[PDB]
Amino acid sequence: GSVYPKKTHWTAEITPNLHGTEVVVAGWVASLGDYGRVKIVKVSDREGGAAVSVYLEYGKTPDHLFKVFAELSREDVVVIKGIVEASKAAGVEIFPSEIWILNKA
Amino acid sequence: KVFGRCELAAAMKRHGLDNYRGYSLGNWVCAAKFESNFNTQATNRNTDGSTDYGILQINSRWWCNDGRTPGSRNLCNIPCSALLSSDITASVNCAKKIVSDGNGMNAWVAWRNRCKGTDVQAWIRGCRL
């Protein structure tokens, strides 16, 4: 049986030196971006704090996660599990395996 | 129209893309290379019913209107067919909005996958600008 995971990291703890680490973040949707093949949800857990980027990319991100993305609104309360990926530009983002909506705004 | 590399670099500089939102000219040339292969007429249908249009492959869900995409927002306030002209004005204007949306050039998957973190200035090296 499925159960939403326990938060492992505050959004401010998501740093480039966590590249390759599986994390669970929890908070609210700060913003949404839909550019077609790339979609981005930003999650915050403090006011005036980080807004960590969670990216979805067609052909790489599981298609069921795009269905969850379509349900998302700003201020929704979410739990996201994924792998931290440090920016190639060298700042940080999350490649999700799970997106849970705990409540809609 | 299929632009050559340095031809596009000059056009993009003229249209004010160099350092727009902190992105040097090479980023934009590299993005166009891997999004459209420098082809202004490039169009590609996605599985979600949306289509990507032109030199910078702008998507029909949020950004341009192609009259066939459900949930069209048309934030660039432009027909998608206008993004297929040999003149890049319309694509540049819409690209400027897209890159200002809060995620910088991460809006372009080809830029993320082929340009981001590489020596992008190589794409404008040797060009008369």
Residue numbers in the entry:
A (entry chain B): -1 to 88, 93 to 107
B (entry chain A): 1 to 129
Task: Please share text taken word for word from the publication where this structure appeared.
Sharing a common range of epitopes centred on the HEL active site, these OBodies were also found to be efficient inhibitors of HEL activity.
Selections from the first affinity maturation library yielded the NL8 variants AM1L10 (KD = 5 µM) and AM1L200 (KD = 1 µM), representing 6- and 35-fold improvements in affinity over NL8, respectively. The crystal structure of one variant, AM1L10 (KD = 5 µM), was solved in complex with HEL by molecular replacement to 1.95 Å. Comparison with the NL8-HEL structure showed a moderate rigid-body shift in the arrangement of the OBody-HEL interaction relative to the parent OBody NL8-HEL interface, constituting a rotation centred on R35 of approximately 10°. Residue K37 was re-selected to parental type, but the like-charge clash appeared to be ameliorated by a conformational shift in R61 away from the interface. The L4 residues remained predominantly disordered in the AM1L10 structure (residues D89, M90, H91 and N92 could not be resolved), suggesting that these residues were probably not involved in significant interactions with HEL, with the possible exception of pre-binding long-range electrostatic associations. Surprisingly, substitution P51S did not result in an appreciable structural change, which suggested that any advantage this substitution granted over parent-type may have been a manifestation of different dynamics at that position as well as surrounding residues. The crystal structure of the AM1L10-HEL complex at 1.95 Å revealed two major factors in the improvement in binding: the introduction of additional inter-domain contacts at Y56, and a consequent moderate shift in binding orientation compared to the NL8-HEL complex.
